[PDB]
């Protein structure tokens, strides 16, 4: 029947809920909240609530792991759908905790966290399948045995959910939801989808590779700082996609008595190729196979060469993927990067911004979060933390809450039931204490981010916004028209203008609008690389942009090296290496190399050349209309009272940049907070204000900073004229 | 394998090394391939263990004793020749270096068709464009690029043909048509493996791509093409042909273009050493790398070596006495390569006044060719060559645009035509998105050039053009000897 689709990872967290596209929903005869019934590859069915999501196509039907392990359907398989609506309100259903997840958890766990979830929202029920409930810091898999003599059941107040719990073991057909999967990684979206596309076809359908002459991907080089989830990602898309996952430690093979270690290395590969299409994971390929040139012993050279020969001979069987984990690609010997041996690098990188947020919800869903936690704030607070730190941060705050409840509940030495854990509510105190205690593991590594700065956060510069969106967004969506006229699109823009005017903000907005990774190389980094004669690190930065494509590379303070030299002939070491890497990356056509200069007059003229930063966009001081938008964008988060006059503050400030207005609004916020704190402490010492009042802005404007004024604004205009190059050719007309 | 012999238990590894040579000399005239001679025989001086020294010495003795049988070739693979111990380069032991180098330009194209002939390519793929797109990729990357695009097409067809777990026949594969989407996605996903290595290329720039400079073209074709095809007449008169030309003139006027055209006309390899490379070697005190560059030109002969921005090192010092580190090593290597007579050492200076006078000497860059700003006639050819690929409407007046622009270099006219193309593409995209939001232009119209000429750049003008002319006079050295006649 045409009512059969392909499964996709669900963007929601609700269990027994199917998210489908609206045209497919009406083609499938589905209403807004109609129950949709599914038939899997094996003898099991599960009725689910339909959901209208616009992020998926008709064929892509979103499903959780909950409605995937019971349906015996892996990610990227065919699901059969047929509706069958009957009332059938459940009469004394037989949901049971029968599994291996109920260990050391006793008490009223049968109903404490089932009433808020399993007895709410009229969710559909089925027998023979297993759903999941996350409560009391516990993710419990509950199976249901009887749901009335019908394959379609809906929960009801008379379902009773009577208690018949047993330690009955699970069957091998069902997959453990406690085991990792696609939903257990949140900090990586593009990098996880890369591995998905890489290894879904070779693993799910090895017969196609055996049939069609292709070179299957046999070798992965997942690299990144330790604790970023490379092992987690390997286990996730090796058990959810594949069926066997080997986890040789790395130090285990470097530790054993030479011959036995190599025997284990051979035997792991053999068992991978003997059992089924599997994934071999080398967690410490940097340790097993370091740079052979710098090695001293020869038995380690024998280990490296034996690994090389095993990988070269692993071209057979057409179905075995070999994932390898390391901290950086320039530390492995330059022989594990050859064709057929870890030729694909899928660099993970530090989790960035909302990605860290997307990690926290994975380690908090089983836990509780009360109602006062600012997960976005703690996500912006945890800068420089790999996913392991966020797992520890979510575990240290939970342990802080538990240890604060230990004094409340004294003498407790039992299973501690599951009701007090349900009553546990981790607040901002525990998370703040854990964040203060937690230490970043990967902070000095350059962060590859997708910025949260949008066009709404950019005040004014409408002409600059139009030029940017017609210069970088145009080629990425209309390549045919660019190819027809025979012109390589301009890559690289040098934003010149007054400092603190919105160049980094504009670059971040460009990165966010195109949903591309953003690498900001600030002036401190360039000056550090210049002073220590570390220009060879510049290459690494570009290599990072090559491994995080598409990138919106931003060289903030491109004149910082020129400023540090006095402000002869320019052409410094780091700037020259930047020029060389720009010439190298001009053929990438996937990374943008945006620059920035707060003093464009003292700059290397080589930076202004085709292939390099040819297009020049001037970021002028905001005018009367632009300052209103700048102040509104800098005060959207702040609770500003309506009685203030921002469009008059725009009129009064004439030569104020975006940074100056941001300082003005931040000082107004500071005075508002100071007055609120003074009032609160005075009331506490005796026994307030809900918004930034007018007087706060009145007092803040007394320290109104104008960083750039008069001749400085002239200089850019001078550099404008010298770079506008009208040269008297304006208003030039051809003859008829 | 190489690592196979470095991996086994010493004695068994050497037994396999002996037995491979024996079976090669026992069966028939064969070829022994050492895929990792760099791994089997690294620099013996820097090695720590002695059993690896035993391996290196045993390989050396086997190769020395391989002078027999008169029919066994022994190929060896490595990443660079300066990493092997300086004993596997002796006579009779890998004495011939046949350096492969990164595939260059159309060569990468010539690789793609090898990995695409068995595959399909639909009808919209621009193989030349993706060949120009895959800069810095070895043939393995192109094999993976042709395999990742094919796999992208297959995986996009997996959703169309559901439930397929069979041999998948051969008819749907015939119906498979890899388009530009798959190749673009694979190129974005693919990572270059050899990008930092210097590229040895045969340029696609021909004399047709060079606008104007007919006298310079004639001088070049009579100065470098003449000796390579008439050596007997050069030998008869007793004169070593001039090797090395210093192109001086305004920047962005066609010096690199002329060098590439010279390389393409003679079908010789082209090595471009730009100003960034020289400045990097000067700043890091890496002048020893200059040798390597010349060594590359020695292993890619014939070469048309081009030192773009030969005054870049002098510019970075202020613009005393010149004679910088990298320029001095370049002088030494020029003196070394003056006896090659197979590589040309063309230079380029956008500011020839501040240059090392040692660079102007016999054996070194003696001949000097001035690349002047294009005149009224040359600008027509420059604009036509820069607009051959672009679909320019016939109603435009390029020979009038040549008249209007006076001090415009080739780079300035190229920027003008590129900006006209940019405005044409912008108008086309605006019209298309407006039609899509409501429901165009087929060529670069007149108004596009009209708007582009409003930002007409003149990079070099007035006294700058004087300076080269000054350097012309100081180097023309008429000295009053013009119109000098012998007595009868
Ligand atoms: C006159 N002579 C004749 C022969 C030859 N001319 C020819 O025949 O070919 C012309 C072409 C082209 C082209 C391309 F080379 C890359 C493209 O893809 C866009 C894209 N994808 N990602 C990016 S980065 C972006 C991702 C968004 C966030 C930021 C970074 N860009 C892109 C965007 C802007 C600039 N540059 C590349 C499309 C093309 F049409 C040379 C000249
Ligand atoms: C007065 N004292 C008396 C005794 C002695 N004089 C004498 O008796 O001998 C004179 C001679 C000679 C000669 C030669 F030494 C090399 C030749 O071959 C040409 C060639 N082949 N490839 C190249 S490079 C080219 C390949 C094309 C693309 C670019 C690079 N060139 C070549 C071309 C231009 C300049 N130089 C070499 C021919 C000769 F006739 C010394 C002076
Ligand atoms: N992107 C992520 N999302 C969720 N959890 C993560 C992420 N990255 C790391 N973690 C957590 O950090 C831990 C890292 O463990 P592991 O993957 O074995 O080591 P490594 O990350 O060094 O390979 C995992 O237990 C995982 O729960
Ligand atoms: N056009 C603008 N709209 C909104 N905020 C701006 C604008 N320009 C600057 N800002 C504010 O200035 C602050 C710093 O700006 P910055 O990016 O450092 O300027 P520049 O790029 O000139 O150095 C940011 O917090 C931002 O909120
Ligand atoms: N004589 C010419 N004919 C055609 N195009 C030219 C000419 N001179 C320069 N150009 C154009 O200028 C651009 C860059 O020139 P370039 O080789 O950098 O000049 P220079 O060698 O003086 O630095 C090239 O894309 C080329 O198309």
Residue numbers in the entry:
A (entry chain A): 22 to 588, 594 to 713, 727 to 775
B (entry chain B): 270 to 588, 594 to 713, 727 to 775
Study text:
Human p97 ATPase is crucial in various cellular processes, making it a target for inhibitors to treat cancers, neurological, and infectious diseases. These approaches have revealed a dynamic molecular machine with three distinct functional domains: an NTD and two ATPase domains, termed D1 and D229–31, each harboring conserved Walker A and B motifs typically associated with ATP binding and hydrolysis. This homohexamer structure appears as two concentric rings, formed by the D1 and D2 domains, that create a central pore capable of binding protein and peptide substrates for segregation or degradation.
A higher-ordered dodecamer was also found in the NSC799462-bound p97 complex. The two-dimensional (2D) class averages of p97 | NSC799462 showed that both hexameric and dodecameric forms are present, similar to previous observations on the wild-type or mutant p9747,62,76–79. Since we did not find an asymmetric form of the oligomers among our three-dimensional (3D) reconstructions, we enforced symmetrization with C6 and D6 symmetries to the final densities of the hexamer and dodecamer, respectively. The final reconstructions reach resolutions of 3.23 Å and 3.33 Å for hexamer and dodecamer, respectively. As shown in the previous studies, the dodecamer is formed by the two opposite D2 rings packing against each other via the α2 M helix and part of the C-terminal tail. Superposition of the monomeric p97 structures of hexamer and dodecamer does not show significant structural differences (RMSD 0.778 Å). Although the physiological function of the p97 dodecameric form is still not well understood, it has been suggested to be inactive due to its higher order structure that may limit domain movements. NSC799462 binds at the interface between the D1 and D2 domains of the adjacent p97 monomers.
